[PDB]
Amino acid sequence: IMGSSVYITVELAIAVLAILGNVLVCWAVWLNSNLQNVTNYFVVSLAAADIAVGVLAIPFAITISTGFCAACHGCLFIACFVLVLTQSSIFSLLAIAIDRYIAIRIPLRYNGLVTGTRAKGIIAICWVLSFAIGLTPMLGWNNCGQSQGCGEGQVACLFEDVVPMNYMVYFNFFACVLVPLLLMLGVYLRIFLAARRQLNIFEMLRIDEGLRLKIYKDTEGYYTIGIGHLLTKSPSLNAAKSELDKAIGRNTNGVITKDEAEKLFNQDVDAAVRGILRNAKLKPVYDSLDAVRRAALINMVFQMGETGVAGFTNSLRMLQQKRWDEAAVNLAKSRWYNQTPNRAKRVITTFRTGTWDAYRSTLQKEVHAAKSLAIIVGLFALCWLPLHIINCFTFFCPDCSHAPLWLMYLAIVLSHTNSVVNPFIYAYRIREFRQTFRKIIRSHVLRQ
Numbered sequence: 001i002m003g004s005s006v007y008i009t010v011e012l013a014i015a016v017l018a019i020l021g022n023v024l025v026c027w028a029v030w031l032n033s034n035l036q037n038v039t040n041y042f043v044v045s046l047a048a049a050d051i052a053v054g055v056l057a058i059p060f061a062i063t064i065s066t067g068f069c070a071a072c073h074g075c076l077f078i079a080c081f082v083l084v085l086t087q088s089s090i091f092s093l094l095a096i097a098i099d100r101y102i103a104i105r106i107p108l109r110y111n112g113l114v115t116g117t118r119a120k121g122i123i124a125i126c127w128v129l130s131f132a133i134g135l136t137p138m139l140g141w142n143n144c145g146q147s148q149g150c151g152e153g154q155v156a157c158l159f160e161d162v163v164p165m166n167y168m169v170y171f172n173f174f175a176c177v178l179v180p181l182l183l184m185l186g187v188y189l190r191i192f193l194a195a196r197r198q199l200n201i202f203e204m205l206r207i208d209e210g211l212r213l214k215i216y217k218d219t220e221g222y223y224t225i226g227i228g229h230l231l232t233k234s235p236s237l238n239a240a241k242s243e244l245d246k247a248i249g250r251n252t253n254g255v256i257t258k259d260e261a262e263k264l265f266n267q268d269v270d271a272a273v274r275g276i277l278r279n280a281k282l283k284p285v286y287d288s289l290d291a292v293r294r295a296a297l298i299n300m301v302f303q304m305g306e307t308g309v310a311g312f313t314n315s316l317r318m319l320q321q322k323r324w325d326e327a328a329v330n331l332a333k334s335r336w337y338n339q340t341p342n343r344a345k346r347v348i349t350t351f352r353t354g355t356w357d358a359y360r361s362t363l364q365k366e367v368h369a370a371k372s373l374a375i376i377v378g379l380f381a382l383c384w385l386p387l388h389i390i391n392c393f394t395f396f397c398p399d400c401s402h403a404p405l406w407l408m409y410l411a412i413v414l415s416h417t418n419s420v421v422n423p424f425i426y427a428y429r430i431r432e433f434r435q436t437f438r439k440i441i442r443s444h445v446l447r448q
């Protein structure tokens with residue numbers, strides 16, 4: 001058996017798995033409306049690039065491994081096409097990382113800013129940039145515009161013979177790969193730290209009532225800032241800014257920092273606590289509650305007012321009697337629960353447990369998808385970095401012994417393997433994908 005026959009068989013197997021797996025990804029998104037969100041628009045664009053790796057890039061790699069004689073511009077397309085697909089993968093991975101960041105940082109205003117029309121525009125632009133970046137050697141930055149044994153007008157189609165190494169290192173690796181990879185590392189780190197933020201009264205009502213650092217209108221149309229801090233009933237934003245500047249201590253033009261919103265919210269808590277202590281019905285309960293259960297009581301006061309909370313005579317006395325589970329059942333049978341069940345369920349869970357578990361869980365639900373997508377970037381890095389580092393050695397140590405043939409084969413094949421792994425990750429970590437996969441395979445493929 002020839003070593004070439006092993007290499008070709010391995011490449012063709014990777015090609016088939018790349019096409020089949022990533023066709024299944026696009027097929028699932030097209031079939032399942034629950035997978036038709038903006039995040040999976042970039043998943044499909046990423047899946048399309050990996051299909052093209054199996055149909056074209058891998059066959060292109062097998063042909064240029066022979067170093068055949070070809071015209072320079074035709075040889076450069078065969079060699080540089082995989083650079084287009086790899087660059088498109090980077091832009092899609094970059095878009096997925098950014099999309100998940102604003103999803104957890106502005107969870108309320110995510111849909112208004114992140115839309116399907118904008119995602120489709122970014123995808124079309126990124127595919128154009130990928131061709132411009134990948135096929136840059138075709139536009140003049142190549143080493144065949146100036147191989148003995150090929151005849152003039154042709155060159156031996158060898159990648160390192162035709163693709164300049166300073167392009168591969170400075171422009172492609174450092175600027176077009178390393179920088180987006182490090183930015184993706186910082187974005188996902190920022191996502192993971194936000195999910196691990198310490199919970200307190202400020203973060204509890206940030207989840208329940210939102211945080212806005214810019215002045216906005218509420219459900220009535222009253223100007224508001226921070227965590228539900230009313231500024232004025234006047235129909236003038238300038239009147240609201242005047243109230244904001246007085247409370248903050250500086251000219252704001254309607255924008256504040258997170259610490260300024262937290263300080264403004266700390267004063268609102270002190271006012272609500274002073275009102276609770278003045279109420280003869282609420283003070284004995286508040287005095288008996290622990291710090292976290294007091295935050296749930298302040299939560300209700302911020303939503304319904306001191307008088308509204310005082311109307312929970314039965315639930316309040318069971319809270320003061322430390323009968324947590326009984327108070328939960330009673331509070332769930334109230335109008336406040338029926339009107340806003342999600343916020344009420346989180347507040348009632350706080351009363352039962354005395355922990356922030358209901359608000360931590362809200363944070364983890366927003367980031368579990370991010371951990372699976374972050375694994376894909378790591379596998380992309382692990383699969384492509386060996387080639388980039390080899391290119392850096394050849395570039396910066398010219399008299400160094402070139403990497404042996406077996407490592408070159410392994411690094412090239414490993415890079416192609418990256419076009420197979422993503423559908424396996426979705427299947428193992430994302431249930432909506434795994435379930436759609438099973439339906440497609442059992443129904444459309446296996447017919448039963």
Ligand SMILES: Cc1c(C#N)cccc1-c1cc(-c2ccn(Cc3cccc(C(C)(C)O)n3)c(=O)c2)nc(N)n1
Pocket residue numbers: 061062064065082083084086087159160168384387388391405408409412
């Ligand atoms: C394309 C790329 C990207 C991207 N996107 C990122 C980093 C590096 C590279 C990259 C690729 C190649 C390179 C060379 C040759 N072949 C054909 C081939 C197949 C099997 C065996 C051989 C042997 C060993 C016989 O040469 N050749 C390739 O497929 C790929 N070379 C270099 N320096 N960098």
Ligand SMILES: CC(C)CCC[C@@H](C)[C@H]1CC[C@H]2[C@@H]3CC=C4C[C@@H](O)CC[C@]4(C)[C@H]3CC[C@]12C
Pocket residue numbers: 389392393396397400
């Ligand atoms: C955040 C970190 C990882 C970025 C650092 C960039 C890395 C990938 C780059 C920057 C400097 C580079 C090194 C510069 C000089 C040398 C010595 C030479 O004889 C072999 C290549 C080698 C060893 C290079 C390998 C790749 C290298 C380490």
Ligand SMILES: CCCCCCCC/C=C/CCCCCCCC(=O)OC[C@H](O)CO
Pocket residue numbers: 002003004006007010405406409410413414417421
């Ligand atoms: C996700 C990471 C794990 C999955 C990916 C693991 C690495 C890729 C699999 C490789 C075997 C291919 C290595 C051998 C390369 C071709 C065979 C060969 O070298 O034969 C040619 C011979 O040297 C002269 O003709």
Ligand SMILES: CCCCCCCC/C=C/CCCCCCCC(=O)O
Pocket residue numbers: 017019020021023024423424427434437438441445
């Ligand atoms: C016509 C192509 C559609 C799929 C063909 C049938 C399966 C081919 C295998 C592709 C590897 C996909 C890896 C992840 C999918 C796992 C399947 C599953 O979740 O049950």
Ligand SMILES: CCCCCCCC/C=C/CCCCCCCC(=O)O
Pocket residue numbers: 091094095096098099113114115118119122125126129
């Ligand atoms: C143009 C090349 C750089 C693009 C790479 C990825 C950056 C975009 C990331 C995707 C975020 C999800 C969609 C958000 C839409 C932005 C709203 C807008 O400003 O129009």
Ligand SMILES: CCCCCCCC/C=C\CCCCCCCC(=O)O
Pocket residue numbers: 019023026027028030051055
């Ligand atoms: C191997 C190259 C060609 C295969 C890749 C493209 C085929 C798979 C693409 C996505 C599958 C889901 C989208 C199909 C849309 C069908 C349109 C329609 O029937 O109205």
Ligand SMILES: CCCCCCCC/C=C\CCCCCCCC(=O)O
Pocket residue numbers: 004008012015016054055059062063065066
């Ligand atoms: C998934 C479909 C892809 C299969 C169709 C493309 C066929 C593969 C392309 C070339 C096959 C081998 C031809 C080159 C011989 C290389 C042997 C050598 O290096 O000496």
Ligand SMILES: CCCCCCCC/C=C\CCCCCCCC(=O)O
Pocket residue numbers: 055056059060063069070071074075078154
């Ligand atoms: C599934 C489809 C796979 C198609 C694989 C095509 C393989 C392409 C291999 C090289 C042929 C074109 C490169 C050389 C021709 C132009 C240069 C010249 O004419 O001298």
Ligand SMILES: CCCCCCCC/C=C\CCCCCCCC(=O)O
Pocket residue numbers: 055056074077078
């Ligand atoms: C799904 C099928 C995809 C169709 C694309 C087929 C791939 C063709 C491969 C390379 C062709 C362009 C490279 C050389 C072009 C010049 C060749 C010539 O004119 O003699």
Ligand SMILES: CCCCCCCC/C=C\CCCCCCCC(=O)O
Pocket residue numbers: 120123124127128131135
């Ligand atoms: C000779 C090289 C020829 C280069 C052709 C490629 C130039 C066109 C740029 C990208 C083609 C793929 C189109 C994908 C964008 C559509 C996706 C979308 O709109 O949703």
Ligand SMILES: CCCCCCCC/C=C\CCCCCCCC(=O)O
Pocket residue numbers: 128129132133136140141142
């Ligand atoms: C067309 C969309 C925008 C394109 C800008 C980014 C894509 C890359 C474009 C060309 C880069 C050219 C780099 C030139 C470096 C020196 C050239 C040389 O030494 O021969």
Ligand SMILES: CCCCCCCC/C=C\CCCCCCCC(=O)O
Pocket residue numbers: 166170171175176
């Ligand atoms: C996705 C990010 C794209 C960023 C593109 C812009 C970055 C360009 C940075 C410099 C690359 C080229 C530096 C040296 C030029 C080569 C010198 C020469 O050969 O003429």
Ligand SMILES: CCCCCCCC/C=C\CCCCCCCC(=O)O
Pocket residue numbers: 181182184185188371374375377378381
């Ligand atoms: C240095 C270039 C960039 C390197 C990869 C960047 C992407 C980093 C994203 C997250 C890594 C994987 C996250 C999965 C968490 C697994 C838990 C663990 O291993 O500690």
Ligand code: NA
Pocket residue numbers: 046049050085086089418419
């Ligand atoms: Na890819």
